[PDB]
Amino acid sequence: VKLQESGAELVKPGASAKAACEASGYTFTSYWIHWVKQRPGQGLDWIGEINTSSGRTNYNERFKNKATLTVDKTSSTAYIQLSSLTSEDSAVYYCAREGFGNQSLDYWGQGTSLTVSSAKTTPPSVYPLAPGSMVTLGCLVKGYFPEPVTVTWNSGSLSSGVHTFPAVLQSDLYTLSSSVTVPSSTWPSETVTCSVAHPASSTKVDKKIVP
Amino acid sequence: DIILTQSPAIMSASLGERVTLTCTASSSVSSSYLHWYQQKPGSSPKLWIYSTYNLAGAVPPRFSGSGSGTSYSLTISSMEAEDAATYYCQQYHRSPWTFGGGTKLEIKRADAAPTVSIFPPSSEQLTSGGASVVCFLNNFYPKDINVKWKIDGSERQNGVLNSWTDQDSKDSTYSMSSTLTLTKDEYERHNSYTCEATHKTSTSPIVKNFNRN
């Protein structure tokens, strides 16, 4: 039951991080905890196991010298510490409980999203994508950091026929675009406005598409 | 150093169809220590089957698994929409513990052509010396597609970044964005810009153009 890890962690390359995974709803010392790594778009890669009673560890060789696992049985929390960080370490880090079923992983945490970048917060540029029965318009949202941005169209009253694409790392900055299809007798007579929010720099930008 | 191979990595099935995923091990694993996990995008994996055959908490009985030695599988008798996801095997027979590379199971639907749209660099962007040309390829199936950029008739591969949506949960299409980034001076040295989309629903490319002036 439960397993609470932080959702996101931003760290500079070269540095170290210590991500915490707090159990609850079970007798913590009865179960081992495993950490698993998942690179953006990729599969699952075991890091290592820790016996929660005794503190003894076993490591995927690959991560020997990258990861240290530890426990504190007094607070019911497992820890992972990644050293000497590079862009290659950017990944979701899951803590899992090993579960009486023959070492199978019965409960997972929601995972900690670790980003290894030097970038500073940087708000986005918002560029209208206007063409030169249906018409497609769009919004290029470029040069921001960190994730996420949210993009709506006319504040949310254009919800259907929208595609907002996943971000890509262009430089050490993110870029993404969003498309909206509307009926052609709607635009340009009625207004279509890209609404773009970037919380991390407390910025909203509204951009209308003009012909 | 026991490699688990999941072939194929990607699979399509219609709703109602029987489905079989395979996990193959490079050396015998004891069926007791073989497991399966399901993962949907942005969620954590979940235990689906453990010790080869045992359905986990909440797994419907349309699912079964079997195997032994180097040959394991997970069967879905009659596919349902909920069952589209990525499934991983995993072994605990010898350390280091490993997973297979996963089989992503998507839903089969009728083929469809991408609606293609090209957009020149906006004026706002040109005032910074940047210049991005954007092509949307929207609502197509199957996922496999090729996108080619041509500047004054010649192919360009430098400065192109793509991005794909996840199988649409309502209509089971996919979409893609293609973005060609040039300097402003670069963009202004040339006239014709084309996005050519190739896809199994036609033999000739879908072609979208503009000429700046």
Residue numbers in the entry:
A (entry chain A): 2 to 133, 140 to 218
B (entry chain B): 10 to 222
Task: Pull text from the paper.
The envelope glycoprotein B (gB) is a major viral antigen known to play a crucial role in PRV entry. As the viral fusogen, gB is essential for both viral entry and cell-to-cell spread. In this work, we immunized mice with soluble PRV gB to generate gB specific mAbs and identified a total of 15 neutralizing antibodies that effectively block PRV entry with either complement dependent or independent mechanisms.
As the only complement-independent neutralizing antibody identified, the 1H1 mAb recognize PRV gB in regions different from all the other 14 mAbs. Interestingly, the 1H1 mAb displayed a broad-spectrum neutralizing activity against all PRV strains tested though with varied efficacies. To further characterize the antigen recognition properties of this mAb, we solved the crystal structure of 1H1 Fab at a resolution of 2.5 Å. In this structure, we observed an unusual N-linked glycosylation modification at residue N103 of the HCDR3 loop. To testify whether the glycans participate in antigen recognition of 1H1 mAb, we introduced site mutations to disrupt the “NXS” motif to eliminate the glycosylation modification. Compared with the wild type 1H1 mAb, the affinities of both the NL and SL mutants decreased almost 1000 times and the binding kinetics also displayed significant differences. The intact 1H1 mAb binds PRV gB with a quite slow kinetics but seems not to dissociate, while the two mutants are much faster in both binding and dissociation processes. These observations demonstrated that the glycans in the HCDR3 loop play a key but not indispensible role for antigen recognition of 1H1 mAb. According to the structure, the epitope of 1H1 was unambiguously mapped to the bottom of domain I in PRV gB. The binding of 1H1 Fab to PRV gB is likely mediated by the HCDR3, LCD1 and LCDR3 loops, among which the HCDR3 probably interacts with the 220-strand region and the LCDR1 and LCDR3 mainly recognize the 210-helix. Collectively, these observations implied that the main epitope of 1H1 neutralizing antibody is probably located in the 210-helix region of PRV gB, among which the residue R214 plays a critical role in the interactions.
